[PDB]
Amino acid sequence: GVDFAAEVRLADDVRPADEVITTAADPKEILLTGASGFLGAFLLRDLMRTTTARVHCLVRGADEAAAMERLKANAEWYRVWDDIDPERVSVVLGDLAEPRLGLDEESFDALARTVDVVYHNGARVHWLLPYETLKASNVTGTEEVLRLAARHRTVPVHYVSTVGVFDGVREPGVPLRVTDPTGPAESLPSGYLRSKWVAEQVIEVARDRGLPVSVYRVDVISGDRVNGACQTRDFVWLTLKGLIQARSVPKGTEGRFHLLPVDYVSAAITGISRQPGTVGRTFHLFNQSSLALSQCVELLRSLGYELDEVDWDTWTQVVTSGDNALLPLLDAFEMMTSDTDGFYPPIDTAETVAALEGTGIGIPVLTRELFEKYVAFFVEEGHFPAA
């Protein structure tokens, strides 16, 4: 068993420099981690649109040219590369899982001295791996990012977290507040969520030492509202994919999905990060609105997919018979449908709506058109079968 109370520690060298900058209006040099991933591609695009800064992107790879091509191909898959200015993209070859982010002395020192703000979005998101395996990327990597931001000149870190650090609701029916206790780690169902919980706790120590660190706890991210571009391996779309594959759905089974478009998340995080009086605070990004499971099924039926209603046993035997995206998620699908309110605790977002007042930034409505864009993206990219 992991002693999670002992895992909450920040190396004593991670402390504010003599100069501490708490805002980053009009930044000139930005460090972004996780730019070769889903949210990171949209964070990169939005920083291009909302600053004039060069964006140093920490990317793993053999050499800068190969890392650049990885970053590019990811952005092209999400259909945002055309919105990015490559002349403002600077690849920083490194690794969240190794000391000083895998940088050499010259690069570490130069970024520590000159980056105006850090968006710490990179992490290893694996729903099964144990905490011990994810610690280096997700916890120690966060400590290393904090080390870099703090050293020489202290600049703000904007850390992407998850509403999953909560173990359900504090008081029934009361939306979870940004100040509410999280964890305990042992109550969280995955090593991944436990690693994010530890990172947050490490960040609380940094905050207690005077280091400027904002935290954005994000819920499930769905595709962008323009092209529908979305990662493939999340519970929502694998659930719907499984139903499509099984060509059926269990009778009398209802649930919901709180979809949060990725381009809302990127715009919100970057937008809040410039709003006044937000540095050092924690924010919840969560869509109060949802699409019911029955709504998704009806929408898929209207697109031409065969989804016959069958008894639970017949359905689960189809799913467990092989080649079905839901098979490893059957337990989660059953928990979500049998106690949906328990599965999706209410989340308070008032601080988030207030900070975004007047920014033009808002969650899109979950329309039929939006849903159809989502399915169309997966069908074109080969992730969903055609109807």
Q: Name which of 69, 71, 157 is nearest 111 in CA terms.
A: 157
Q: Is residue 140 a contact point for ligand NDP (CB under 6 A)?
A: no
Q: What distance in Å separates the CA atoms of residue 217 and residue 200, rounded to the nearest whole number?
A: 10
Nearest to 36 by CA among 115, 105, 121, 109: 121
Q: Does 121 appear as a known binding residue?
A: yes
Give the C-alpha separation, 112 to 150, whole Å: 7
Minimal distance, residue 251 CB to ligand NDP, in Å? 29
Find the binder of ligand NDP among 45, 54, 56, 124 (CB under 6 A). 124
137 is a contact residue toward ligand NDP (CB under 6 A): yes
- Where in 224-263 is the site for ligand NDP (CB under 6 A)? 231, 234
Compare residues 221 and 244 and give the one whose CB is closer to ligand NDP.
Answer: 221
Q: What end-to-end distance do the CA atoms of the chain give, in Å?
A: 47
Q: Is 162 in the site for ligand NDP (CB under 6 A)?
A: yes
Residue type at 91 in one-letter notation: V
CA–CA separation, 229 and 231 (whole Å) = 7
Residue 260 backbone dihedrals phi, psi, to 5 degrees: -125, 105
Q: Does 144 bind ligand NDP (CB under 6 A)?
A: no
243 annotated binding-site participant = no
- Look up residue 123 and give its two tokens: 């992490």
Is 221 a binding residue for ligand NDP by CB under 6 A? The answer is yes
Residue 38 touches ligand NDP, criterion: CB under 6 A? yes
Minimum distance of ligand NDP from residue 355's CB (angstroms) = 18
- For residue 387, say whether it is annotated as part of any ligand binding site: no
338-377: contacts with ligand NDP (CB under 6 A): none
Amino acid identity of 34? Answer: G
- 273 lines the binding site for ligand NDP (CB under 6 A): no
Contact 164, 196 (CB under 8 A): yes
Strand partners, 60: none
Contact flag: residue 383 with ligand NDP (CB under 6 A): no
Binding-site size for ligand NDP (CB under 6 A) equals: 26
CB of 368 to ligand NDP, least distance (A): 22
Do 149 and 155 meet the contact criterion of CB atoms below 8 Å apart?
yes
Which residues ranging from 40 to 99 are in contact with ligand NDP (CB under 6 A)? 40, 58, 60, 95-97
Whether cis (ω within 30° of 0) applies to the bond prior to 276 is no
HSE at residue 235, side-chain half, CA atoms within 13 A, is 23
Please state the closest distance from residue 215 (CB atom) to ligand NDP, in A: 11
Residues that bind ligand NDP (CB under 6 A): 34-40, 58, 60, 95-97, 121-125, 137, 160, 162, 196, 218, 220-221, 231, 234
